[PDB]
């Protein structure tokens, strides 16, 4: 029965997480213009991305493991300020080692944003709305990623990427203070108030199936998101604007996938779970759309086909992520939640890392088309393996 605190703190969290994701992907968008200005090869960008992904994986694992020695409001503000500062210092730089270092510091700082977001969510809300509130808050990433790719490309006509990065850093710095002044860790303003072992958890042959299902989906999604603009600009003849709009159309369907995965899971169709069929259909759609994008798209093709393929791929790729997040927590052994998700998140992050330097060097050796061929083959093999392996124990922890 509290008022206006829920609104203020929720808006603050939305803004903060939007800025985090916008900074990471603002490097992602300025990559082509940086390549045009600074003559970077095909394997330095992958090196930078891989370094950032590894740093983010380590930071996220550490922050998930240690989530008690914090105030949940100083950590958030410090992370936002550090991200803004590293972006500002990234704006004024030329060489490759500096880029890699200043982006391994950004990836390290990026791990302190999400873990403290739940420490206020669990305390400011009744436990009957946390499930939907998590899903509502998770769309900030899609909102931030569906606006940047087109905005930066359409603004770079008269202003260089340096101005964009500097302004993004300044905005992050200011919103750091604006969010430190508003977020409340726990309700204390006027006065408000409310067997199992690791051996038996790692040995269950379902955690690794879920984990590899996630190292494959996340790696494929990250590789496609990061290199679709380059695949469109080079090889097949399309302008830079069409390539940028592919990413924005990818996140437009991603928002629908995350917010409708839960709706389609429990309803309609209802060991195993009554979501494997939907998950397999989503994976098959992700493979078919990626194959069609690789083959059908040519120099002469209406942009509507490209946008439709991007939206379909986004919908087919952002659904399994939410499905995995739900299923891992639901099938986790009792009193082992959180630590049953840290491993899954760590392997998803390492799969995202695998789509950096190795993908870049595969493309550099032969072509982009071969790299996407390998990605499609991997996805198809994983889908077939999932389809063959359904009746396995999903009650890990004790039997
Ligand atoms: O993928 P990131 O950058 O860790 O974003 C955090 C959230 O991203 C969502 O996509 C996952 O389903 C959540 O479980 C996760 O916490």
UniProtKB/Swiss-Prot annotation:
Phenotypic consequence of residue 179 to R: In GSD1B; inactive glucose-6-phosphate transport
Membrane topology of this protein: Multi-pass membrane protein
Cross-referenced SUPFAM superfamilies: MFS general substrate transporter (SSF103473)
Tissue specificity: Mostly expressed in liver and kidney.
Signal peptide: none
Gene Ontology molecular function, alphabetical: glucose 6-phosphate:phosphate antiporter activity; glucose-6-phosphate transmembrane transporter activity
Reaction(s) the record says it catalyses: D-glucose 6-phosphate(in) + phosphate(out) = D-glucose 6-phosphate(out) + phosphate(in)
GO CC list: endoplasmic reticulum; endoplasmic reticulum membrane; membrane
Regulation: Inhibited by vanadate and chlorogenic acid.
Primary subcellular site in the record, as a coarse category: endoplasmic reticulum
Gene Ontology biological process terms in this record: gluconeogenesis; glucose homeostasis; glucose metabolic process; glucose-6-phosphate transport; phosphate ion transmembrane transport
Main function: Inorganic phosphate and glucose-6-phosphate antiporter of the endoplasmic reticulum. Transports cytoplasmic glucose-6-phosphate into the lumen of the endoplasmic reticulum and translocates inorganic phosphate into the opposite direction. Forms with glucose-6-phosphatase the complex responsible for glucose production through glycogenolysis and gluconeogenesis. Hence, it plays a central role in homeostatic regulation of blood glucose levels.
Family annotation (NCBIfam families): 2A0104
Family, as annotated: Belongs to the major facilitator superfamily. Organophosphate:Pi antiporter (OPA) (TC 2.A.1.4) family.
PANTHER family per the UniProt record, alphabetical: GLUCOSE-6-PHOSPHATE EXCHANGER SLC37A4
Disease tied to this entry: Glycogen storage disease 1B: A metabolic disorder characterized by impairment of terminal steps of glycogenolysis and gluconeogenesis. Patients manifest a wide range of clinical symptoms and biochemical abnormalities, including hypoglycemia, severe hepatomegaly due to excessive accumulation of glycogen, kidney enlargement, growth retardation, lactic acidemia, hyperlipidemia, and hyperuricemia. Glycogen storage disease type 1B patients also present a tendency towards infections associated with neutropenia, relapsing aphthous gingivostomatitis, and inflammatory bowel disease.
Protein name, entry field: Glucose-6-phosphate exchanger SLC37A4
Organism field: Homo sapiens
Lineage of producing organism: Eukaryota, Metazoa, Chordata, Craniata, Vertebrata
């Amino acid at each position: 029965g509290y008022g206006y605190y829920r609104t203020v703190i929720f808006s603050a969290m939305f803004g903060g997480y939007s800025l985090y994701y916008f900074n990471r992907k603002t490097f992602s968008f300025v990559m082509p213009s940086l390549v045009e200005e600074i003559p970077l090869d095909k394997d330095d960008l992958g090196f930078i991305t891989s370094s950032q992904s590894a740093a983010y994986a380590i930071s996220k694992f550490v922050s998930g493991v240690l989530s008690d020695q914090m105030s949940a409001r100083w950590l958030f503000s410090s992370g936002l300020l550090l991200v803004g500062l590293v972006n500002i210092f990234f704006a004024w730089s030329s060489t490759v080692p500096v880029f890699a270092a200043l982006w391994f510091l950004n990836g390290l700082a990026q791990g302190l944003g999400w873990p403290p977001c739940g420490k206020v969510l669990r305390k400011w809300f009744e436990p009957s709305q946390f499930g939907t509130w998590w899903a509502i808050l998770s769309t900030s990433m899609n909102l931030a990623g569906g606006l940047g790719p087109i905005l930066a490309t359409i603004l770079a006509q008269s202003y260089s990427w340096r101005s964009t990065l500097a302004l993004s850093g300044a905005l992050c710095v200011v919103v750091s203070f604006l969010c430190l002044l508003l977020i409340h860790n726990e309700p204390a303003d006027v006065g408000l108030r409310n067997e199992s072992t690791l051996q038996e958890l790692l040995l269950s042959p379902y955690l690794w199936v879920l984990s590899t299902g996630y190292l494959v989906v996340f790696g494929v999604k990250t590789c496609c998101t990061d290199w679709g603009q380059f695949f469109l600009i080079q090889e097949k003849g399309q302008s830079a604007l069409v390539g940028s709009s592919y990413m924005s159309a990818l996140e437009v369907g991603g928002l629908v996938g995350s917010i409708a995965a839960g709706y389609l899971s429990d309803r309609a169709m209802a060991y195993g779970n009554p979501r494997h069929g939907l998950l397999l259909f989503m994976m098959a759609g992700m493979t078919v759309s990626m194959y069609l994008f690789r083959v059908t798209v040519t120099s002469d093709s209406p942009k509507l086909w490209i946008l439709v393929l991007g939206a379909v791929f986004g919908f087919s790729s952002y659904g399994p992520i939410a499905l995995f997040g739900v299923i891992a927590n639901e099938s986790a052994p009792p009193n082992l939640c959180g630590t049953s998700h840290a491993i899954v998140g760590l392997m998803a992050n390492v799969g995202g890392f695998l789509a950096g330097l190795p993908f870049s060097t595969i493309a550099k050796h032969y072509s982009w088309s071969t790299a996407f061929w390998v990605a499609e083959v991997i996805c198809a093999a994983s889908t077939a393996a999932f389809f063959l392996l359904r009746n396995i124990r999903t009650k890990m922890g004790r039997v």
